[PDB]
Structure formats: C-alpha cells, structure tokens
C-alpha cells in the first residue's frame, strides 16, 4: 500500500461525488428558493393599502414552508409513493404570519395557510432527505432513485435546465448586405426587457431603441451624457495615430447640422422625438423627460447626477463598432460558450411565483373594499375570513404550470412553452440521463449550422460524445461528469476591494491614456483602468486561493484589445482543476494519503489552496496540463482526471478511445431505451407502460463511470457468447442469429406491464356509478365474456385474459344531464352498460388490482396488466457500441459450431461490420472479455486508458487458448473443421425496445374519418396507410394507367354522384335543385375528396361548372 500522486489522484473523484452528487443543479437551487429567496419577495410587495378607509393595512412579517411555529413538530405529511398512485400532488402548505388593524386595535396572527407548494424528492423539505434505507424501506421508495422531480397529480415530471444568450452584456454582429450592428440586451429585475442597437447606415454610426419613436444619431446622445467638448468624443472612441479618425470624423459634423454645441441643448433633441408612453399625469417638463430617457436605456448602469460612468460605457460600445469596420476579423460569435448562461431550476420558478403572488394580493384587495363600502360594516369587521377564497389561486396556478409546460408571464409578457417533460422510466440510466440535459431556445436560426456544430471550447465543460440526432442534431446537449454551475455572490465588495489593490477611479483619469493603459471590466463596465495587470491579477488569485473572496470569479485577460475582465454574475459553467505553481505541482501525496484515511473530504482541498474552479473564460489565460509526466516550468493547472469529458449516460461504453467517433453518439440515443431493471420497488409501482426483464446480468468489462452511479447494481442486458462469422446467408448486413435452445433456457425473457384506470364519477342529481356484474344463462353464470369478472365486478387477479372478456364492469346512469326533480319516484333501473374490453393480439395476465380514493372523494380503479414473451425473430438487439440488429432466423442447437470443450456460441454476427464501422472497441472488448472470467476477476476498461492489451494476452495463453482470442471451431452441420479460424468469446448484449408484436398492423376495411371519409391515421385508431405525393410521382414513371386509378378512387374513397348536364353543378338523390326539373341527370362516380372540394369552393363565390361528354363515338 505504497501510495503516490502518480496514478492515485482518481481516488478523490468519488469524494467529489459523495458529498456533491449527480442532481447538483436541480436540488441546490430549490433549496436556495425555499429558505432564503422567499423572504426577499414579501419584503418587495408588503403593505397592501386601501385608499377608502385609509387606516387599514395588511403587512407580511415573514414566510415559511413546512413546519408550524406552534407545535414545532417535524412535519405531518403523505409519503410520495403513497401519493404517486392516487393522482395527488406531493405538497406541504405555506405558512405566513400577519398583523393588521381589526378594529379598536391592531393584532398579529400566526401560521396562516395560503397555499400548498410541491416539493421535489431528495430536497431537504421532504421526508426522504437523510434517510438510511430503514425509514425508506417503510416508505417503499428505492434507495438508488436519483430524485429531483415533481410528481404533480399522478404522472411525474421535471423541468429542464434552460439557457439563453448572456443578458446584461454586449456582443458584436457582422453582416454583409445590411450593415453591421452590435446587440446589448439588458434586464432590470422589474418589468423591463430592453435591448439596444447601434447601426452603421451608409458609413455613419447611428442608434435606435424600442422606446424612441425614430433613430437618434450618436454625437447627440454623448453630449446629453455630459461629454460635450467634441474633441473628447474622438478622444474616447479613436485614440491617436490610427485609421479610426478617418472613419469616425463623418459623425462629428451632424452636431454642426443640428446646431446644438452644448450639454443643455443636447437633451431635448431626444425628447422632441421620444415615443410617449402615457403615464396619464404627463406633466412633461421638456427637460425632465429627456433625463429619464437617458436613464431608462442600457440598464446595466444607473446614475445619480453626473451621467459620467454611463457616458463612456456608450463610448466603449461604439469603439468596437469601428474596430469591426476596419477589418472583419474582430467579430465574435453568439454561440461561443462564454456568451452562454445556464440558469437553473429554483431561480426560474421564482419568476412564475411573482405573477401569481401579485395576482393574489390584488383580487384579495378588491374583495376588501367591496366589503368596506358599507356604512354599518365598519367597526368590528375582520378581513381574515375571506382569505381562503383567494388561497388556492396560488395552488391551481402552480399545478397547471408544471402539468402543461407553458408559462404565461406578465412582467415580461413571454410565452416559453415546452418547459417540462415526462421523465423516462424505461431504463435506469434513462431516468438519470434526462436529469442532466440542456434545452436551447430555438430563435429560428434553422439555416445556420453554427450552433448545430460543436465548438472546441467544451473539453470537460459538458459532454461531447452525447447528442441526439434527427429533429435535434446539435441543440440537445448534456453535462459532463465533473461539472458545477456557478451562482451570484455580490458585486459592491469587490469594487471596494479592487480600489484597495492599487487601482483608481474613472472620474479622475482623462481618456488620453486609458487606451495607453488597460481597463478592468466589472460585468462589462469600465471602473478602474489599471496598468501592469500581471502584478495585479496574480495578487487577486492569491487572495482567492486563501479564500477571502468567493471562488466563483474569473480573471479573463485578453490582449487583442487593451482590456481585462471580471465576472461575478453567476449562472455560468465551470469545472475544478488542481493548481500547479511552478515546475512542480501542488499535488503533495501526503495530503492525498490523508484523504483515504477519511478525515478531510474534497471540500477541505479548496480551503487550503490545492484546487479552484475554472470557467470557459479562465481557460483562455491558463495553460492546463494533462499528466504529471508532462510538466513544463511554465505550465499550470494539471488535469484532475482526463476521462471526465463524458457524461453519466455515455460512460458505460467500454474503451471509447479506440472506436470511431460517430459510433458513440448512436449508442447514447439507444442506451436510454434499453430494457432492464428500474428500481428496488419496481414490482410495487403502478405506472403507464414499463418493460421488465427476467434474468439480468452485470456487464463483464466495467468502467470507472458506472461504479459512481451504481449501474452494475441493477443493470440491463446479458453477456452471451459471440462467435463472429457469416452463417447460412441470413446475416448479410448487421443481422444476427441465435439458437432455439439458449432462449429456451431463459436468454432475455422480457416482461411488459401496462396501466389502465377509470374514475367513478358522481353526477349532479346524486347518482353513482356501480360495479354490478355476472349475468347468467342456462344454470351457469360464466359466459365466454365473463370468466374473469369476480364477485365484486373487479376482474379477479391471477388468471389470463383474451380478446373480449371484460375485466372492469362499469355502468353509468342515463339521466346524466337532467334537472333534479325533488322527489323519489323512478330510480330503480337506469344503468346502461359500458365495460372496458381488453384488445391486443396476444393473451395476457392481470398482475394486481387496487382501489382507493382521490383528492376529492371519488372512487378510483387501477388494475395493472402483465404479459411476457420469448425473443422470436424481428426484435432489435444491440451491442453497446452502436451495431443494431434484427434477429434474422432461429435455428436449432446442433447446427452451430462447437469448440474442443463443447461450448455452443449463442449469437453470431457476420464480419461485414468491423471494416466499415471501424468499431475496434468491440474487438478489444472481447480480448479483455475472455480473459476476465477465466481469471475470475472483472476487468476495468475505462476511457482514455484502462486494462492494457499486452498483459491481457498472457493470462489467456497460460490456460491453453489462443493469444489473440481466435480459437478454432468445428462445423455443426457437417462435422469437420473450418478452413479458417473464428474470433470467439463473450460480448455484452443488451436487449432493446421496438419489439415486433406491437408494430404488426393490418387494416382490411375499417373506420373512416367523419369529414373526408378516408381511412384514419393511428394504430390505436385502427390505421390505414398514407399513399403520399411522391409515391404518386413514383407510379407515374412506370406508365401505368389503371392501378393508379383504383388505388386513388376505388380501393380508398369511392363515392357515387348524380350530376346534371345543363348548368352543371351537383344535385342530390333525384333532383338538380337549381333548375327544379329533375330530368337531365347523369350518374358518375368521383372520390369523396373531389365532391367536398366542389362544395366548400362553392361556399365562396366561385362556381365549378361541370361539362359532360360521352365516351363513345370518338
């Protein structure tokens, strides 16, 4: 046990995931919401007032979610698994305390109910926080559940981590045919979403905004900000001894065109042409409305008197618009990761809580003055008794806000739809892969494949081998394994702190030398104008390494421009790295030996100064190092572990650094659809459609990723014997042949579970729904449809069902909408039958049947169906490296090859894949695959390393097998040897979805749609295929002129029309009904889609007059 820091840095990676798990972004935002973020909202909407009767006031002192202040018990709560099968919402009520004027005096009241918030699992306000599988065994929830998801009224959902372009900063834009702009979108935290634009029309800098009635040029809006001398304008933007004077000097004479020349006259040029939003008072001064028009603009900065720091913020924004016109190399892209802001769950539902909470205490205010407009009702009235009527507006707002994923905001007036999804419980890692994914914004750049592509500034930030394809090929991305999202800290202390480190203020320095010097940008604003930054920025890190400042700060310092940047805004991506000070790192393995003793976790390493976080910007100044055997004396930031670039759902690929790069993405889309196990309580839950698998196996070659998320403890798929060779012609491309015997021994017996549910509804006239059943005939109750009804009407558990044979007998009254006649005369026999039939092509069983009651008292019926099946041909097998396969044929046991010891290979692949697909990883999976179970030890095939090949061949040859795994075989058909040898052994094969019996479909003569009488789309809608438009183009090139007519009129849509000759439009059975003579009627046949055109086109005032000839006598 002689440890070193050479290869044992890996043993701190699990210490990072032990205290700081896999759902880091979802829970740590909601835990920031419930504790701290609610007090900051009641303090911003307190003291509702009534202008009538002015001595009445309701103000909020605090707010709490969960436990009371009287009893001080932990909580009284329904467990979530008891809640997720009754279609209820897992909620705990919100309690506030309030004080107000009842009357003679003011009183305070404690613990008022106002609403019921939903709480995500594994957040600290639930029961499941800090349980030790003993309380959790009582609550029948799996210990290995990831958590972090709402279960709102039944089906369980989760909101995604959405992101947008970086607000409150600037970009640049370059366009050829239109002129060039630069965006600067900003957002004050109340009711404003304002974005500014600077345009170069025909060689002149301009400025427009969505609150000004038209364009206002640039020399005005800087003389209105105080800078008036008109040499300082050129001195800010251009500098000295350049070509910028030749481009910019056109703008200066428009000051001479408008004859302004001073700071007084500059303002009212704007307010003469401001677009007037009416405030309905409108005492506009013609001097005061311009100062606010130079205040509600570029909402990064606000001003007291001097306008000065806002002035040169515009001047730095117009410097980069003339730097781009000099050469178009200065352009930035709006898909660089530094211009992206991930923002997480709890600080995103906080916006929806505003528009409900202000809608609470205004209709509650409107209920107050409606009572207080009474003369007698003024003395002893209490207002608290009408708070329960407005209470549930918060609840029913929030519940549909998670159910239907669309959010109707008001302070921004914004309509983000698709904000949540239903999580996939198809596999285990499918329930964790969707927990770490990123949804983009779709701003209609479908032509631009820029953000469709993948940028190199992504190594370890978020995963690179995982992305879906098809409908979104580059717009769905996934977090890396070691990944933390920042959060905002503060900004006024560091502005006081940088002054201490030797920087001055902007209000002292002239612009004669700020272009000579550098400049600090705090969130994009110039505040210090420092020189010699390399003394300055290295003293800033050394405070951060000791931890006087918060560690989520970046000191990006570029040199293409003469500026340095600071960032403290929070909501941006970062990873940690270990500090390397000089030609020796700060690894210090005596620290690393003290970690495995266990007294100091990962959190103590960033306290002492051995690790700090790096975002995407701070990667650009640093010079990070791969391995300790590659240290340069000018080399920092050694890599903590190199295989941390793949997320938790791509990590199960063995040796991904050998195979081709596209054949990892094709497995990430299909690992998440693998049949396997779900949870420890998986036979207890009642969900919609789950696949379960009988005899699973843990995979043979593991990875260091899959032992972090316990994939081995409930895996998916078996590891059968694969002998890659062609056989019997049934494997031409990526087909695969498996025996009749081994599936009979239990190879991949899957199992299908299905929910069905009904609700017993109580109508207006007080009539119930009843579960009577079992009609009889001829000494016998059980009819062929009634062998499984049971005595109670609920079809009894344990026996099989077929087509027909209802299993929940349901009867509804016939007077569902009649007025209640207040008597008792005729209610004895009014139930018309409506059972639920089991369709399906194969007889199944019913697994268990339960009944209970919902939120409001209605009886529930939920019975769970069950069927298993043997893997016959057609089904879709996989190989965990992206080699799909339909089962070609099932042959008997004697026909396969057989080795010296009698091993029959289970599944045979043809060799026509490995040259094209370049999947060398499977060829290295098998050499490490054969050697492990012969030595009896599982083997580690990781990413970017793993079990080497040269020491793996030696353990194979010590037993007697071949050195390259390539053993010989005999032929099971004819008895002798094979002229060549066969590559041989076990490969891990997981079964996949898309089995064939729920895709076999056929429709002879079925339903027709009500409007156009064609066959109806949808398998459950009993199908019928769409013969499309280029398929109409495919027939016509064959010259065929008869089956084209029958397949578009006769077999599909035939219809019989009698039409008139003169004034030729349609008529019914025996008339013309426009010349009421009924004589000239000639019968033909046309499609129903041609009749219906000839009527709705006649509904507007155009007439399809038909004219008719006879066929004969040509």
């Amino acid at each position: 046990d002689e440890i070193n820091t050479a290869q044992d840095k890996w043993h701190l990676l699990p210490a990072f995931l032990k205290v700081k798990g896999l759902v880091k972004q979802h829970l740590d935002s909601f835990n920031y919401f419930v504790d701290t973020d609610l007090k900051k909202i009641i303090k911003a909407n307190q003291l509702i007032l009534s202008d009538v009767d002015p001595e009445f006031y309701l103000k909020y002192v605090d707010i709490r979610v969960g436990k009371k202040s009287s009893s001080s018990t932990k909580d009284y709560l329904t467990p979530p698994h008891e809640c997720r099968l009754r279609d209820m919402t897992y909620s705990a009520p919100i309690y506030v305390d309030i004080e107000y004027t009842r009357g003679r005096n003011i009183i305070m009241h404690k613990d008022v109910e106002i609403g019921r918030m939903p709480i995500m699992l594994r957040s600290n306000k639930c029961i499941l926080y800090d349980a030790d599988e003993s309380k959790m065994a009582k609550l029948n929830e799996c210990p290995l559940d990831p958590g972090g998801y709402f279960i709102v009224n039944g089906t369980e959902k989760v909101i995604l981590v959405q992101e947008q372009l970086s607000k409150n900063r600037i970009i640049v834009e370059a366009d050829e045919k239109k002129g060039i702009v630069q965006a600067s979108v900003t957002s004050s935290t109340h009711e404003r979403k304002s974005k500014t634009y600077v345009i170069t029309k025909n060689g002149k800098i301009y400025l427009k905004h969505n609150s000004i009635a038209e364009e206002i040029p640039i020399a005005i809006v800087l003389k209105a900000c105080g800078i008036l001398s008109d040499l300082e304008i050129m001195q800010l933007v251009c500098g000295n001894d350049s070509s910028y004077q030749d481009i910019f000097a056109v703008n200066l004479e428009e000051s001479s065109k408008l004859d302004i020349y001073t700071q007084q006259q500059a303002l009212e040029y704007i307010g003469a042409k401001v677009k007037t939003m009416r405030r309905q008072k409108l005492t506009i001064l013609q001097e005061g409305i311009e100062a606010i028009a130079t205040t509600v603009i570029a909402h990064l900065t606000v001003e007291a008197l001097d306008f000065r720091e806002k002035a040169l913020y515009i001047a730095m924004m117009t410097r980069r618009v003339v730097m781009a016109m000099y050469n178009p190399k200065m352009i930035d892209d709006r898909d660089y990761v530094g211009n992206k802001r991930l923002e997480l769950a709890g600080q995103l539902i906080s916006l929806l809580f505003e528009d409900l909470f202000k809608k609470f205490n205004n209709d509650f205010k409107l209920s107050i003055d409606k009572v207080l407009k009474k003369p007698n009702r003024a003395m002893e009235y209490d207002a608290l008794l009408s708070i329960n009527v407005h209470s549930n507006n918060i609840t029913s707002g929030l519940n549909r806000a998670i159910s239907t994923g669309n959010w109707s905001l008001k302070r921004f007036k914004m309509e983000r739809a698709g904000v949540t999804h239903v999580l996939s419980r198809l596999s285990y890692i499918s329930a964790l892969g969707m927990m770490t994914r990123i949804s983009s914004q779709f701003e209609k750049s479908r032509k631009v494949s820029g953000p469709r592509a993948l940028q190199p500034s992504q190594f370890g930030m978020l995963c690179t081998a995982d992305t879906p394809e098809g409908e979104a090929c580059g717009l769905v991305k996934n977090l890396a394994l070691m990944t933390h999202i920042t959060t905002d800290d503060e900004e006024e202390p560091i502005k006081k702190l940088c002054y201490v480190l030797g920087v001055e203020d902007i209000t002292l320095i002239d612009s004669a030398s700020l272009h000579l010097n550098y400049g600090v940008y705090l969130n994009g604003t110039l505040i210090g104008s420092i020189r010699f930054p390399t003394k300055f920025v290295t003293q800033f890190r050394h405070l951060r390494r000791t931890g006087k400042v918060s560690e989520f700060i970046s000191i990006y310092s570029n040199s293409h421009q003469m500026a340095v940047h600071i960032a403290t805004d929070g909501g941006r991506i970062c990873r940690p790295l270990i500090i390397v000070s000089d030609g020796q790192s700060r690894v210090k393995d005596i620290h690393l030996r003290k970690l495995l003793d266990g007294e100091l976790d990962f959190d103590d390493f960033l306290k002492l100064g051995l690790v700090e976080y790096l975002d995407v910007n701070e990667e650009n100044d640093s010079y990070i190092a791969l391995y300790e055997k590659d240290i340069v004396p000018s080399m920092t930031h050694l890599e903590i572990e190199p295989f941390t670039i793949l997320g938790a759902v791509a990590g199960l690929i063995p040796y991904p650094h050998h195979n081709q790069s596209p054949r990892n993405t094709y497995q990430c889309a299909m690992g998440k659809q693998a049949i396997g196990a779900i949870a420890y309580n998986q036979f207890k839950r009642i969900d919609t459609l789950l696949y379960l698998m009988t005899y699973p196996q843990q995979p043979m070659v593991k990875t260091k990723t899959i032992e972090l998320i316990d994939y081995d403890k409930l895996p998916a798929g078996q590891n059968a014997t694969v002998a890659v060779m062609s056989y019997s012609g049934y494997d031409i491309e990526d087909a695969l042949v498996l025996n009749k015997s081994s599936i009979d021994r239990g190879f991949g017996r899957c199992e299908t579970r299905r929910k069905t549910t009904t609700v017993l509804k109580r109508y207006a006239n007080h009539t119930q729904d009843i579960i009577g059943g079992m009609r009889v005939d001829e000494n016998g109750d059980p009819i062929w449809q009634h062998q499984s009804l049971g005595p109670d009407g609920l079809g009894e558990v344990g026996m099989k069902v077929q087509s027909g044979q209802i299993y929940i007998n349901k009867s509804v009254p016939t007077n569902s909408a009649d007025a209640p006649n207040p008597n008792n005369v005729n209610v004895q026999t009014q139930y018309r039958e409506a059972p639920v039939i089991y369709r399906g092509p194969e007889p199944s069983h019913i697994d268990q049947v339960m009944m209970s009651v919902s939120d409001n008292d209605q009886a529930l019926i939920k019975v769970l169906l069950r069927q298993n099946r043997r893997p016959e041909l057609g089904d879709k097998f996989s190989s965990r490296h992206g080699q799909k396969g339909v089962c070609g044929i099932i042959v008997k046991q004697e026909d396969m090859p057989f080795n010296d010891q009698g091993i029959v290979p289970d599944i045979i692949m043809n060799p026509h894949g490995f040259p094209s697909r370049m999947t060398v990883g499977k060829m290295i999976e098998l050499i490490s695959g054969k050697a492990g179970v012969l030595n009896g030890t599982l083997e580690y095939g990781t990413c970017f390393g793993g079990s080497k090949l040269e020491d793996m061949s030696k353990i194979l040859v010590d037993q007697g097998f071949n050195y390259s795994g390539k053993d010989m075989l005999y032929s099971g058909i004819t008895g002798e040897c094979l002229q060549a040898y066969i590559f041989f052994g076990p490969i891990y094969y997981q079964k996949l979805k898309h089995m064939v019996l729920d895709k076999m479909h056929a429709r002879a003569r079925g339903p027709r749609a009500v409007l156009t009488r064609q066959p109806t789309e949808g398998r459950s809608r009993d199908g019928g295929l769409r013969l499309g438009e280029m398929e109409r183009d495919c027939v016509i090139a064959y010259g065929a002129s008869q089956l084209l007519l029958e397949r578009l009129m006769i077999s599909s849509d035939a219809f019989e029309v009698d039409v008139c000759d003169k004034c030729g439009l349609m008529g019914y059975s025996g008339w013309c009904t426009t010349c009421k003579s009924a004589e000239n009627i000639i019968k033909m046949t046309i499609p129903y889609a041609a009749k219906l055109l000839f009527q709705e086109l006649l509904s507007m005032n155009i007439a399809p007059r038909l004219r008719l000839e006879d066929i004969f006598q040509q």
Binding site: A137, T694, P696, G746, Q901, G932, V933, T937
Partner: protein, 67 residues
C-alpha cells in the same frame, strides 16, 4: 432475479452452486477465480453464469406487503 437454473450455452444445471459459492467467501477467504474450480465449473461458459449474476432478490423482499 435469482440464479438461473441452467447455463445459457451448454445446458448443465447451476442451482446448487450459487449459495455454495457464497459459502466459499465468508469462510475460507479465497480468490474468486480458483474458488469455482474447486467447486467444479470446469467449462468456460459456466464461469460467466455466476460471476456476473446480480442477486436482485435480496432487495425486493424487504418491500413485502406482510410487514
């Protein structure tokens, strides 16, 4: 779930050798490779049936409806 009653590839029985393989681990602390060779899984395809078998049944039964 529980150990399968037969090998997938050859066709002999493994239903008496599962709890005996555990009995070669708490007492007589031994290498897992040479343990089954003492137990008698001579062939290749029988070794994989008990090395990779997750025993999921010792977690299902704690969720019983009968306390």
């Amino acid at each position: 779930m529980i150990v399968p009653v037969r090998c997938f590839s050859c066709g002999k029985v493994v239903g008496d050798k599962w709890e005996s393989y555990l009995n070669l681990l708490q007492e007589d602390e031994l290498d897992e490779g040479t343990a089954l060779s003492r137990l008698g899984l001579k062939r290749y395809c029988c070794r994989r049936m008990i090395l990779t078998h997750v025993d999921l049944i010792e977690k299902f039964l704690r969720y019983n409806p009968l306390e």
